[PDB]
Design an enzyme around this catalytic site. Structure first.
Site, PDB file in Angstrom:
ATOM      1  N   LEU A 132       0.821  -1.201   0.000  1.00 62.87           N
ATOM      2  CA  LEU A 132       0.000   0.000   0.000  1.00 62.87           C
ATOM      3  C   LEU A 132       0.859   1.257   0.000  1.00 62.87           C
ATOM      4  O   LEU A 132       0.472   2.267  -0.598  1.00 62.87           O
ATOM      5  CB  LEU A 132      -0.945  -0.020   1.204  1.00 62.87           C
ATOM      6  CG  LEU A 132      -1.835  -1.261   1.291  1.00 62.87           C
ATOM      7  CD1 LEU A 132      -2.675  -1.247   2.561  1.00 62.87           C
ATOM      8  CD2 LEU A 132      -2.732  -1.378   0.065  1.00 62.87           C
TER       9      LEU A 132
ATOM     10  N   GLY B  26       6.542   3.716   4.581  1.00 63.87           N
ATOM     11  CA  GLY B  26       6.677   4.679   5.654  1.00 63.87           C
ATOM     12  C   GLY B  26       8.096   5.184   5.781  1.00 63.87           C
ATOM     13  O   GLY B  26       8.845   5.262   4.801  1.00 63.87           O
ATOM     14  N   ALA B  27       8.469   5.538   7.006  1.00 62.36           N
ATOM     15  CA  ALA B  27       9.807   6.003   7.328  1.00 62.36           C
ATOM     16  C   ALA B  27      10.516   4.969   8.194  1.00 62.36           C
ATOM     17  O   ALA B  27       9.878   4.202   8.921  1.00 62.36           O
ATOM     18  CB  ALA B  27       9.766   7.350   8.056  1.00 62.36           C
TER      19      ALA B  27
ATOM     20  N   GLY C 293      12.222   2.318   7.242  1.00 60.91           N
ATOM     21  CA  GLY C 293      11.993   0.964   6.780  1.00 60.91           C
ATOM     22  C   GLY C 293      10.590   0.448   6.989  1.00 60.91           C
ATOM     23  O   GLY C 293      10.342  -0.739   6.744  1.00 60.91           O
TER      24      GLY C 293
ATOM     25  N   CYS D 234      -8.178   0.270   4.101  1.00 62.32           N
ATOM     26  CA  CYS D 234      -8.985   1.341   3.538  1.00 62.32           C
ATOM     27  C   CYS D 234      -8.869   1.342   2.020  1.00 62.32           C
ATOM     28  O   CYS D 234      -8.102   0.579   1.427  1.00 62.32           O
ATOM     29  CB  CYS D 234      -8.557   2.697   4.110  1.00 62.32           C
ATOM     30  SG  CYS D 234      -8.866   2.854   5.878  1.00 62.32           S
TER      31      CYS D 234
ATOM     32  N   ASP E  17       1.826  14.866  13.008  1.00 57.81           N
ATOM     33  CA  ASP E  17       1.980  14.825  11.556  1.00 57.81           C
ATOM     34  C   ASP E  17       0.589  14.672  10.962  1.00 57.81           C
ATOM     35  O   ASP E  17      -0.053  13.640  11.155  1.00 57.81           O
ATOM     36  CB  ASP E  17       2.906  13.680  11.145  1.00 57.81           C
ATOM     37  CG  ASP E  17       3.153  13.615   9.648  1.00 57.81           C
ATOM     38  OD1 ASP E  17       3.103  14.661   8.974  1.00 57.81           O
ATOM     39  OD2 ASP E  17       3.418  12.497   9.151  1.00 57.81           O
TER      40      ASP E  17
END
Length: 385
Positions: free
Chosen positions: A16, A19-20, A22, A78, A113
């Protein structure tokens, strides 16, 4: 290929997003249900998610699994993100995002964030209803039993969505950092992809400078005046001038037409008969005649103009008298001449639009002037205290 860790099943080919540090999220299976699988490198963000997930607008948490290197977090799958939704209702999505944000703030959790990419559009439920949902708690923080938090951790958040007090001052940041990001998100949805601070390159610099522009909100258009009044709030450089998430929920930006007209009714009934020299009515008339156009009898359709002559008591330079005219024509509406009912109504929806369209600053001006009554139980629907 297929990876099975405990009850969590996912195919590594289905991603999907990334991220940060890894972090990767996959589409996968848990307990014979479609889910998203968040593979992190290890606790804080999980327990914060688990704690707040009971809200409809917060992502639902299912299970955590672990193998040698990774922890696997099964969470609600989602359809998409708010960012990619901007490519073809919007206000309901913003209200849902804010309600979920207010739920986090009530738990002493700051998201820190917030952006279109973080906000997710749910898959349709049994009735086919779709809702905006908050996710990506990785940067979240739970405050101590302190209403502020220190900058010691770093500069969390994504470039251009960060509040200015985070990147710069004596005052520590607080929950209002999310309100700033949310305000940028509000304009992002309303503007259909434009940002208050514009191009991504100079976006974060313009935030630090406080240079912002809303080109999509017309000054003389009622819907845009209410949106600007709210959005200029919440992105304000001074964080203590920003509303709390609960304040944003009460704002007229989310009001239906019945609630707007009912607000005008309760205001008119509240100020009649007050003293025209008193603080309330003086506050309502202070900015007046700009909102009124300085005669509101000349700015209204003639069938209503010739129906208002029954009282010389209506003063075209008074906001109060404009609200009294609305109050009277609403209460007597069914008895009015068909020409006056047709030029006004039908009620409530077309009736309130007849005015707000001709007087775009009326609702915003009246809302800010009437905060003097915000403590009273009559106006509690319209304000937060």
């Amino acid at each position: 290929s297929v990876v099975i860790v405990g009850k969590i099943s996912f195919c590594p080919k289905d991603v999907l997003g990334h991220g940060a540090e890894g972090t990767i999220v996959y589409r996968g299976m848990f307990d014979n249900r479609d889910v998203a699988v968040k593979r992190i490198l290890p606790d804080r963000e999980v327990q914060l998610l688990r704690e707040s997930d009971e809200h409809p607008n917060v992502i639902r948490y299912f299970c955590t699994e672990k193998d040698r290197q990774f922890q696997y977090i099964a969470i609600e799958l989602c359809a998409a993100t708010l960012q990619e939704y901007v490519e073809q209702e919007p206000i309901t999505l913003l209200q849902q995002t804010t309600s979920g944000l207010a739920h986090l703030h009530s738990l002493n959790i700051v998201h820190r964030d917030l952006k279109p990419h973080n906000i997710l559009i749910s898959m349709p439920n049994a009735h086919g209803k779709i809702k905006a949902m908050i996710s990506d708690f990785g940067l979240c923080k739970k405050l101590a039993v302190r209403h502020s938090f220190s900058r010691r951790s770093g500069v969390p958040g994504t470039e251009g969505w960060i509040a200015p007090e985070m990147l710069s001052c004596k005052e520590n940041p607080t929950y209002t950092v999310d309100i700033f990001s949310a305000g940028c998100v509000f304009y992002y949805v309303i503007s259909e992809g434009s940002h208050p601070f514009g191009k991504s390159l100079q976006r974060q610099a313009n935030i630090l400078l406080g240079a912002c522009s809303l080109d999509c909100l017309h000054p003389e258009k009622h819907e845009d005046v209410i949106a600007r009044e709210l959005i200029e709030k919440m992105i304000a450089m001074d964080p203590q001038k920003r509303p709390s998430a609960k304040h944003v929920l009460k704002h007229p930006f989310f009001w239906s037409l019945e609630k707007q007209l009912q607000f005008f009714q309760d205001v008119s009934d509240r100020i009649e008969k007050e003293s025209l020299d008193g603080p309330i009515v003086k506050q309502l008339e202070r900015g007046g005649r700009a909102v009124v156009k300085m005669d509101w009898r000349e700015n209204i359709t003639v069938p209503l103009q010739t129906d208002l002559r029954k009282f010389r008591t209506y003063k075209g330079g008074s906001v109060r008298d404009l609200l009294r005219a609305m109050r009277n024509k609403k209460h007597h509406y069914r008895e009015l001449p068909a020409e006056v009912r047709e030029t006004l109504g039908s009620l409530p929806d077309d009736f309130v639009c007849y005015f707000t369209s001709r007087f775009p600053h009326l609702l915003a001006h009246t809302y800010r002037a009437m905060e003097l009554c915000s403590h009273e139980r009559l106006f509690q629907p319209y304000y937060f205290h």
